[model samples]
Target chain A: AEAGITGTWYNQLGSTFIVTAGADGALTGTYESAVGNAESRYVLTGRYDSAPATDGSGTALGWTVAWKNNYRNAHSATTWSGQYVGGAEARINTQWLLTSGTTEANAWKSTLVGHDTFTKV
Target chain B: AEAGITGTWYNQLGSTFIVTAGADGALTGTYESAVGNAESRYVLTGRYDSAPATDGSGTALGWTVAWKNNYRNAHSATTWSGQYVGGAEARINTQWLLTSGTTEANAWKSTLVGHDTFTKV
Candidate 1:
């Protein structure tokens, strides 16, 4: 079964995204982080591409997060670029860029990159 | 130039959508209604198809709104389906469905459907 974007989604890290989707590809969600509860509540905003081509793999999706800065870590806004991979194990396969808010000498190395697989919860 | 999904947009009705887009196709915005300001602060959520097809016309996009009920005029939720038409005059050609919150005696007649053309503001 194809997993619709609207619902509760949990990542490998146990973080949760409770989402509500608009028919015209708009979505709003609340993210609850598992690793750091310091800023447990994060706002989620993003888009879904409903019009898929014949050769398309999954529905394209993307989202953003602006955390209530913990200050100690000093991480800034982040974005998740993903596609819905649906099947027996429906998931959102995503790559994210976590910004450090500082202009690093080695920006590529300083900016963190990671991947996550989220399943419907 | 092809208009980007980001930035402010306006429809023929003079309604406004103040938007911000994520690189991965996510977006969030505020919608200002030109006709009714009863629920002045309405939310906007939706998706954008950043990866457009070679034969594609305009980027596929969608959005939704859940309005705060103005008891005198009990309207419910709405959805806008659109395509980002680019060129000399870029615009979002959209069709919208507005719900009445009440069960319609004649579903088609009771429910309202309309069209709006939106351009970057």
Candidate 2:
């Protein structure tokens, strides 16, 4: 089942993301980490997309995850779009940008923003 | 441009939702309302999907919106999926459900849940 994608993943940066995949194909979760220092901690909420393998392998899957960093008042969010290679491990690439409030609409290049990858924990 | 979907909407219940649509087709926003009583208010974060018309009209659009009600803890959230028929107003239908933590995965029927509709404000 697609539920196989549900679990905890840790990024190389030492941060962690806890995810849950719904039967309705809805993906949701939380992420915790300190960006600058231990004092600079953030908790983000996320949504994702995953589906069955198309290669006829019946085991591989593809997925994409987007996290909103509204830890304070909606300013920027990150989107990690990648594939979940077969097995317990996977890699995801991301792009973080400063959004208008919490919505991704009306987005523009801001001085503060970034990206990265995460592996299964 | 597709940026037209960015704006504020109001439900018949008097609740309000502020949304923004990104150039990458990512939609984000906030929803505020009182569900329990005049004193019980909820603030929800949301993600959405919107695209240009497929019928070749070049003016119509299609979209879907989902909101997470993690006002306090990880629990139930709502999803509003509808199309923005070419006009000054649009109608959206919604469904509220109890999710495990903030993720929609592993969802099951719970006593606390429901649905609703919203019109362009």
The candidate that wins on TM-score is 1
After superposition, which runs of candidate 1 have C-alpha atoms over 4 Å from their true positions? A1-121, B1-3, B35-39, B69-75, B104-110
> In candidate 1, how many Å is residue A6 off?
9.4
Tens digits of per-residue lDDT for model 1, B1-39: 123767888877778888876765566678877864646
The residue-by-residue lDDT of candidate 1 on A9-104, one tens digit each, is: 888778888887676556677878787464687666665554443343455555656544332222344556555655567677665654432222
| CAPRI grade, predicted model 1 | incorrect
Chain A TM-scores, one per candidate? 0.79, 0.56
User: Which residue pairs in candidate 2 have backbone atoms (N, alpha carbon, C) closer than 3 angstroms, thus clashing?
Assistant: A21-B105, A22-B104, A22-B105, A105-B21
lDDT of 2 by residue, A32-109 (tens): 664544333433333332334344222211122222233332222333322333354544433332222211131122
lDDT for residue A116 in candidate 2, whole number 0-100: 56
Worst 10 residues of 2 chain B by lDDT: B102-111
Evaluate every candidate with DockQ and list the scores: 0.04, 0.04
What iRMS does model 2 reach? Answer: 13.1
